[PDB]
Symmetry: D3
Subunit: 180 residues, 6 copies
């Protein structure tokens, strides 16, 4: 009786959006493998194994039914007790925006917590996190593509309100451009 | 040339049912993450991280093309040598029924063994298992939702014949109610 | 806006084929679980837990849009730094063909490296690998089904050119026979 | 020097009782109840746990301590990473967890690793998320249930009280080392 | 006490020869052939296994035992959980596995952990599923094949025979400790 | 014998300086900076790493060696499998990695396990894939960055130079053991 289909297009962003949204995990916490979602098939592909001896600091993925200036969905880093599998989805609250420039191109990402993790669900601002946790995250993105000669600048994190604007705008943009 | 589709609806229960059936794994042995199947998309979602420091004692999941009084498929706990991934399916023989009341509502589940695990496939009754293994399982369900203030009573396990009745009835019920 | 569908049929073999091809992983490096792809649903199933205390020496899987005399796609063993999940796909370069007879029936398989692993991507011939790595692999296939009374003979590995012929031929065969 | 029996021959550390060395018996997420053998100083499997439960954090004991139960003072250690049995690390106390193990008092220390850059800046159990405490409480309440042993756990007390209990257990250990002469 | 060389300074235990302490060299699922260094008593990587195989259970040896091969009596230990190298645990013997390692007899003990609530109630290898035995047999038959070493494995014998072999190896160890004087 | 402090009481081995025993402090893929405690000879958590990085290979030190930094000579060990902290193994040197850790020279050895059937036949770092070297170089360049410590790493030098550095560090260790008298 039901659809069975493509996580970008066919997974609702969720009724709590943009504050709380569904989020499809591409990469697990601790992974050296950079999975990404194949836009055409909706399968998970290995984009690459990472060039440095680094691992993703948290579960990482994208928000369905979003679109950015790069023609990709909006990416999210999700803090929570446990590692989660590629291809699963979860409910996440935005707590900040991590502004970045990836090879001279804007690529801001959301930092968030899982809304169904009983430890992490009560966070609302990244300022509430331990400052090291930010320094670690910021570093990861600075460093993860260094051995591919790709420069990534990371600025200071911006507040929840700002993140929510980005999500909201990417929802709008998906709905505008996806039809054609 | 083939379908590619929703594990509840589009996976046959299998020609050996109700004695031996297909079974879609939602949660791995040792997992603190409570995955479940999204009824609408057929994706795996994180329902929650568990509130206690407990882990699932075996691979856990549901039987496709079943339905119970709760509008959900019939759940199964699957004993076998190895942990199995969420979203995979396997062949399992019923060896008992574990009667439960979850917050004042009936929620009986099947206890089973993987029919293609060369160690576990020869079990036929849960009485054949070590009594501790039952005590552990029974405990897990008593304890796993305690920190959410949800009470779960677990009674003595009932035999294979009884489990098979439940599976059979849930097959029938799926076929009756799923059309409309 | 996109398909969302069956990895055998709906995943392109890729524009680099037959030299570099997409490859759907069924089994992870180190796994005792023998997953395989369900031809009908495109789900991953447990075919079996292995009968010996052996584990797969590398990520293992099949090439989409291939077909062999056995009515199955062509299988691949993929060397790379990291374990990869069942159901994901990756890009792989052929470096040899591993000729086998599985219970009196031909069942040649490809040996390959991940084209997006920055260590392994520069290999082009299996002769470039350490001879032990071959001896280990060869052994695995000789030994993995022994406890099921299934005899598997493995001959000396043949070069890249030969592997590429097999892939090419299986592409052709898929296109010939899949229509009807 | 020669090889060390960890209970006796590992210094508690310069910053004691506030910040102390700590020997890890059990890893975060383990179902194996390792403990350190009193006689050999090796690691022993005391038992595999009777429930489908796991230690919520790295667990062990403070060396050169002693309690009325004749064992060293136990510690739970919050930190980013799981740690091996047999290793020691530096830990700050941030609270004490009063318990009753079958009528016998068996208080434990809740602590953070002092060399873990995230966790080192915590100083009070109240700084942690309330769920973290709820989960730990429940773990001790539940982990021995299938052995038919009751364990009651009361409200956690501040670091000032923890430091006292640690000091008192250093005194007892010493008092015992004197009674060796 | 001081730190212990596990072979010599770890007691075999009060319940020997039926129930004995046992030092774990290799974890369930490991491809690393750890063994305990005779001289230092540390854990050494003897080798990484030559085939894509893994130890089907936790593996090690009984302390204060000795066999004609000049090594302690080896044990395979069935239990719910994997255990670390260097740890010891309590184990009941439930059978003996006769083998021939390149013409030399090298019998091993099959056992269960006595402190594991599931496995502790097994007393005979015949109580285990026949496949479990088939798999173990094959492991020893196959794990050294890529080193060109033949290992033959015969039908497993009952616990009465296992206990004898254990006793006999305690005698040899003792007989050797006498020949130290 | 009795239990061994691994730095002092573990022989470097018959094949030194070319092939040497080697004590593992840190497992491949670990974020925990274990090191061996100088005084107790136990394993200590020095710290949890400040970046989201992991050791690209098993890491440790050569026993009975000493460098100007007052620590033993460090080794990175390439092999099929991860290895536990506290274990030792046999390793061939195949290159040396010159570094500067905050103005201080802190050269390390790059090596393979000699008992690992795949890796044992490597004899020069140039036989490894260039990316492997790029990754290792970067690891040391980056792993202490969030502690505000600069580490410069220069081009790797051949095994002849590695063997010299090893020999020189055996001399220093010895020279120090003489200065004990």
């Amino acid at each position: 009786r039901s659809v069975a289909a493509h996580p970008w297009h066919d997974l609702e962003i969720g009724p709590g959006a943009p504050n709380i949204f569904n989020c499809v995990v591409e990469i697990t916490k601790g992974s050296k493998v950079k999975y990404e979602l194949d836009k055409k098939t909706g399968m998970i592909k290995v984009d690459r194994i990472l060039y440095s001896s680094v691992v993703y600091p948290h579960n990482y993925g994208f928000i369905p039914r979003t679109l950015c200036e790069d023609n990709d969905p909006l990416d999210v880093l999700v803090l929570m007790q446990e590692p989660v599998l590629p291809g699963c989805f979860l409910r996440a609250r935005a707590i900040g925006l991590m502004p970045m420039i990836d090879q001279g191109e804007k690529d801001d990402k959301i930092i968030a917590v899982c809304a169904d993790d009983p430890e992490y669900k009560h966070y609302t601002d990244f300022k509430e996190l331990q400052p090291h946790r930010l320094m670690e995250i910021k570093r990861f993105f600075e460093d993860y593509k260094k051995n591919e000669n790709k420069e990534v600048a990371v600025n200071e994190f911006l507040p929840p309100s700002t993140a929510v604007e980005a999500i909201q705008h990417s929802m709008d943009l998906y709905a505008e451009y996806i039809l054609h």
